[PDB]
Design an enzyme around this catalytic site. Structure first.
Site, PDB file in Angstrom:
ATOM      1  N   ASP A   5      29.309   0.577  49.824  1.00  0.00           N
ATOM      2  CA  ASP A   5      29.947   1.151  50.297  1.00  0.00           C
ATOM      3  C   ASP A   5      29.176   1.691  51.908  1.00  0.00           C
ATOM      4  OD1 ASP A   5      31.578   2.312  48.797  1.00  0.00           O
ATOM      5  OD2 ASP A   5      30.211   3.979  48.207  1.00  0.00           O
ATOM      6  N   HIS A   8      34.719  -1.214  51.187  1.00  0.00           N
ATOM      7  CA  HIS A   8      33.951  -1.012  50.278  1.00  0.00           C
ATOM      8  C   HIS A   8      34.652  -2.483  49.663  1.00  0.00           C
ATOM      9  CE1 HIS A   8      34.579   1.857  46.879  1.00  0.00           C
ATOM     10  NE2 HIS A   8      36.335   0.935  47.027  1.00  0.00           N
TER      11      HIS A   8
END
Lengths: 179, 6, 180, 179, 179, 180, 178, 180, 179, 179, 180, 179, 6, 6, 6, 6, 6, 6, 6, 6, 6, 6, 6
Positions: A159, A110
């Site tokens: 994410d 991420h």
């Protein structure tokens, strides 16, 4: 934490370093020191970095990263459990051909996280800095995985959870260690 | 985890 | 804790590992390390994992799980007291024929727990991830117990408390240790 | 709040409703009631909804939205200051041709926010619900602005700040009120 | 809350009662009192219960429910915004043919919530009581919607979000109010 | 709370008193005052006490109870929603033949609750007092319901939830108000 | 204090101290001590000294099951207090070798817990705690010679016994006399 | 508080004063003022002090007490619910022959409470003061009840709960108001 | 506070209530009441009823100075308690018209305060509080007829007086006795 | 604690046990263990229990008491500083003729303290239990001091502070140690 | 705390005891134990008690005091820094001729401090106890300093700070240690 | 704190004492003990007190001060980093000719700090005491620096920061140690 | 804001 | 909301 | 720091 | 609630 | 727990 | 309080 | 502190 | 409460 | 506690 | 504290 | 405060 020497010290005698927590400066200083100590004991034998970490501080992670690249021995990386954020960055930083994960291990990538408080000008500085940090991470990840910077940018926007097999397909690791 | 790490 | 050398270190010399708390990263790192250490001392002899745990982190539990499956020695599992959530998953992960519980031990199975706060998109990602984690748990439990994935799904939907005997009937363990 | 009647009650006599706070259930119940009351006093004269709001509860906003569409009078919307999230949704919900903003007013659009805690199954339900809520918002915004659902989806992915002029170009309002 | 009389008092003169908050004892006492007062003013004319509520206490909701069924006037129910838990139960409790929701309103059904602390025996009592409360809710919902008790049991097991149209198909309301 | 005169004051003009909260001293003082005021306005006409209460202070409840018994007019009691503890005691204290509950109303009976901290002697005093309070409650409930003291003792030992119909069978109320 | 801390010195004489609230850490330690002692000598008696208000039922059952599993007799000696699970463990000692000191206090009662959530969740929690209680009661019946019905009644609320009373009840065999 | 005027103001028009809370300075100032106001409106008609109070500040209670004794009208006292500590002192302070309690009302007497922190000398001062306050309370209670100071001393040593009938026997009230 | 409000009704009879801790708000109110009463009638007595634990010395002196400045006599009546500055004000009533009820409590003591900081700051604070005490003692001497030395000694610690004792001391002129 | 072994361990080698804190379960377990250990080292020689304690748990104190009476060696008790509540009970429990206090030591006796919360029945149980605990304490103290149970009951009703000389007259100790 | 043995243990080998903190039970038990241990090692050689303490518990201080007077060896006292309250009492308790302070040391004497909360009777007991404690302290200080009890009473009424020289003039110490 | 023995213990073997924290009673007791221990090992050799401290308790500082002046060896003082308040007082207390600071060290002088709460008389006592403490500090500083008392009083009235060179000019140290 | 709102 | 509620 | 401390 | 309360 | 674990 | 205040 | 303590 | 209070 | 435990 | 404890 | 303010 049981005694065999405590268990981690016993493993350090076999050139195994455990990265098993959030990455802050204390953890980085310890791992750096361990890496240097192992190189001084033997500059040719492999070192093994076991990773079960949610990530943490980017500068702390880069202390580890740079130390890994500086020393002569190959540093194998083995993801057990979880390698997220900087943990996954470090997983990917192992010696090419010697980055592993266990089959049910989880890898997550991420964008970097932060904060800024104050005047417009201060916020601007903080924003520029975190964007430059992200470009630096993405560039390195590109080189280590073989993916383009553009692909890394898109894929780290939110994410992104990978299975061990997926992490291998991505180029974050070389092999899934099968039982 | 040997072989090979260590 | 009394000294004989603390009691747990003395048991580790007999290849007994104690999983006696909530499972977080520190606990998993310690148990992993112990497993590897024991394999290096002797790759043939059984290891004994004693379990009294309410569960905890799934990724931490999977570190333990994968380490168990990776090493050559058989890892016996023995539930004393309680094995709930990931603890029961680990109980079930012992070598086939060598998963035990004591008679009054409590075994509990359920679905994984979590949380997500933020944008719709963030919640979606978190939901997808926890659903994938559940499918992975269920698939493995199916293989280890002999029950179908559908039966596991239904039986873990809510908290499901099993006696040791029931855990054996279910295929989570092989034997109830009975006193002579 | 000074006295002339308090100032808001005096404005309500001229068919002006103030949406000047975070939108929660109390605010929605009050605005709904005001809308219905005004329609009962006169079903043909325009009503004026002045908006300076950061948004708030989606269901509360939809109570207001549905009430606006239900009643016979046209509801003009005027953004003074800020219309963010549900506030901007309501700004866009005014009668076509009668949605305005002042020149330095700020309009912001983004996706809905929420939370979910519990079992995997509970999180799934919460995720499905918030995704369905987003689809509903996007579909309505599409109809009200003339933009595609796909464009709305992309443009609301993160916080998107519009000038009054930009809000007009987008179709959220019809005119910038010039001095 | 603006003045015309405060706005809710003005609506009460037209036989409109607002259920616009969490249902606790104070809210139930107020709504009960309003219902009885309206019946005393005119026993033949319809009353209108506007609902924008997340639910709340089951016993408080049953005070409202029983009062609705006791009095002679028909009580129309109109869901604006949200009717969840006991709110949806009350929505469904309106006079047959006169239960409405606005198009974008949200209806949610689920099982009752509670708690019990203490000795095994005390927990048993609390469990028995909440199970009996659930059977009572489900039975009533069955009668009011035309669905079987088994279907209600299954469909309330977890949070179940319905659109206005879906709520109509289910039998929780009779009509979706169209603009 | 809307205006017609607030809603409760409007109902008080029709001789309706609302007991719709936990019973503390303020609530009891208000209800006592309302009862006396209504008796002064008309000593013959019925008063209606609507009850939706989880109970509360026993002494506060007894202020209400004693006021009810003292005044000449009949006080009807109507349980809407819930009457628990002292609330159910007050429900039972209405004029014989004029104690009602709505069909889905909940009635709960149990023993009094309290506490004491300090010296053994102080604990003894507090215990004696709360036991004497319980005997007094039970005796009155016996008279009002027709059940024996022994049955009341047993049935209030723990939380006992009754339906409206059950409360009628027990003698806590006379009728379940049914819809026409 | 140190002589080797005092508890470790006593462990060398096969004495285990259960001197606190029973949680998982305490149970793991006692289980481990029991197993360790059996491995050192499978025939000599072990002595479990109890001064405990009780605590976790599952933790207590770990101790209980371990006691019944091992070959040595485990004597139990209540010094001070044995309440709830502590009294259950006191009663679980080898038959003929359960003791209390004369002024020691023994208390028996039903298990405690809590439950929050949906009706269904409360039902599960209620079923579980009821099953736990039946299991405790049945075992206590067998170990004391009292009927299940009598145990049910006598554990309904907190029930304090003197050492002599605990002996009459069958929770211990002897009151240790000075 | 419902409206008929709020209910307490309506009762004040009939010369009823409500002492329905803990006694602090605000409550005492209000009751004092009410007493004086009623005397100015009519110096011959009775005043009625309704009591449901756990007590409170002794000096505040003495403001009320002294005002009662100063004014010409008789002040009837009626205990509804509870009269504890200073509340029971005030109950006993009503005009002789016109002190009442309802049958289930609770009356409690005990010694005064306080605190002291600091130097030995400061603690001594505080102790002397609270002992003198107790003697003053006991002396007045003696006169009002007909009991000896010695008996009051003994009977107030700890919390002493009296039934209404017992309070009458003790001389704290004259009559238990009985329902017709 | 019931309505006949009771304090305003008493103010019409020239009664002022000092019934709380003395802070600046209380002093400003009492000062204003004193001046207002003097403006309505400069010859009729005013009655200050006192039930107070004391409080701020400067606030008390605002009241004190106002009492001495105005033409009407200000009677003081202690009901309940007059402590610290409250007893100082009790003693400040017009000579011959200072009363207490029989069971009222009067307390005298030295002023209280605090000081934190540099030695020099503590010195300033000490000098100021010592000077405040001298001022209080001097005035009390004049008002009671006791010597300054006796006041100094008798206020060194908390000194509780009965009403009769307060009269013997010269803090009041009469104990009011009931007929 | 300084080191000579820590000071308490060094004293334990001379058969001195320190009861120098509040009595809880940990303290009782330690003292019990020490007593048994000393008896095992030598069953004939005296043990010395030094007491400076405000008391604490009654059940913990009884563990100590019963252990003292069970073992063969005489346990001398010496109060230094303070022996209050259970501390004074334990002081009195030493071997007859060998209970001492230092001249300025303080001995305090009082009744046991506790609490009870819940249903009337629960409070009754708790009250019965604490009353029975008090009877047990009083009976033992009677035997150990030679005072009647009735006298102990009266004298422990409130906090009762004894001088060392008074404690001797009472029968709680045998001698005041004189320099 | 640095090491040479930690520094205090090394000083204890030279018969120096450090009273360098607030006096509570732990401190008193440690100092008592040290005193007794030193007497057992050698009953004729002097012990040195160095004092830098604000005082603390009176009963804890008396444990130390009584132990000092009980043992055969002389205990010298040396005030370094501060001896306040019980610390100054202990300073004064050293063997006559061997009580010292350093030139800039501060000595403070005052009355004992405490507290009491509850019933009048409880406050009375607490007051009596703290007054008796004060008389005991004053009497001993009188004997140790040669001042009258009346003078001690007056001089301890409030905080009284003495210089080392003043403490010597008062009789709390024998000498001010001067530098060579 | 790393190990070679820990670093501070190793330095103590070379007669170096570290005053590296806020000065409270524990720190003073430790430094006093170290000074006396060093004198007992060798009464002729210099001792070195390294100072990096913001100050703290005056009485604690005087324990150190008096011990320094009492013992036979010269105590050199070396300011590294900071010597403020009592730290600077102690810096100045080293043996004449052997007080040093490093070039970038900071020295601060000011008046003592405190507090007082309570009766006027108590505040007076506290004020007198803190003023007497200040006179004592100033007098000693005068003697140690060669500055007049009047100059010290003025220069310590508020926080006064000195460079190392300035501290030397002032007479607080003798030399700036140059590299 | 007139014209035209109102 | 009329027609028809009210 | 030598010379001269130490 | 009439009839009959009220 | 032996036999057989260990 | 009359007589005489007021 | 010697002489003389110790 | 009449008769007689009031 | 011997005899007999231990 | 000897004699005699110990 | 008159005279003279006001």
């Amino acid at each position: 934490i049981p005694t065999v020497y405590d268990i981690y010290s016993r493993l350090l005698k076999d050139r195994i370093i455990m990265l098993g927590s959030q990455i802050d400066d204390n953890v980085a200083n310890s791992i750096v020191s361990q890496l240097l100590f192992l190189q001084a004991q033997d500059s040719e034998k492999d070192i093994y970095l076991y990773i079960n970490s949610p990530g943490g501080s980017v500068t702390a992670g880069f202390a580890i990263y740079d130390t890994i690249q500086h020393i002569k021995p190959d540093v194998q990386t083995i993801c057990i459990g979880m390698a997220a954020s900087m943990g996954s960055f470090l997983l990917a930083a192992g010696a090419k051909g010697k980055r592993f994960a266990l089959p049910n291990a989880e890898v997550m990538i991420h964008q970097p996280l932060g904060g800024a408080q104050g005047q417009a000008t201060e916020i601007e500085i903080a924003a520029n800095h975190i964007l430059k940090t992200r470009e630096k991470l993405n560039r390195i990840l590109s080189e280590r995985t073989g993916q383009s910077i553009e692909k890394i940018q898109k894929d780290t926007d939110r994410d992104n959870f990978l299975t061990a097999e997926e992490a291998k397909e991505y180029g974050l690791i070389d092999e899934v260690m099968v039982p | 985890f040997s072989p090979x790490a260590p």
